[PDB]
Amino acid sequence: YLHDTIERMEIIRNLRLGVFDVLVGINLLREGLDIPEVSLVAILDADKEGFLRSETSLIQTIGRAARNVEGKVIMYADTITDSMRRAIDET
DNA sequence: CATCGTACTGTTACGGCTCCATCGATGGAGCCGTAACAGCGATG
């Protein structure tokens, strides 16, 4: 779980070393937070409107899972929006 | 939450400078007391 960059690099190193298997963050847009071993990312309450749920933010979060050869992105939402439709079409 | 702005203020260690408190003895000479040394006449 992530609550500055000083702790960010330590958390990234711990995740790479296998000390932690999963990571949870309130704002998943900090620079350098991507990892090459991540193969699955989930979006929770994506249907709720918010800045972090915009089309550009969704594309940015989806692009983090492209590092893995078999990386995939899953979504947990019962509703769709125009921004979601555009993001899925582009992907 | 990251980014930006024409050499910043106040309080402590450490080395160098300066002022202030606090702290009988030995040899020479004179004197006294004691020990030591020198220094008529009559007869056979």
- Contact indicator for A39, A71 with CB cutoff of 8 Å: yes
> For residue A52, which amino acid is it?
L
Interatomic CA–C1' length for residue A64 and nucleotide B21, angstroms:
79
C-beta atoms surrounding A15 within 10 Å: 17
- Contact indicator for A8, A34 with CB cutoff of 8 Å: no
Main-chain phi, psi angles of A81, to 5 degrees: -135, 175
Residue A13, CB, less than 7 Å from strand B? no
- Contact indicator for A41, A50 with CB cutoff of 8 Å: no
Residue A56, CB, less than 7 Å from strand B? no
Residue in A45, A44, A57 with CA at minimum distance from that of residue A83: A57
Signed CA dihedral, A5, A6, A7, A10: sign only: positive
- Contact indicator for A73, A62 with CB cutoff of 8 Å: yes
Nearest nt to the A26 alpha carbon by C1': B1
Q: How was this structure determined?
A: cryo-EM
Residue A4, CB, less than 7 Å from strand B? yes
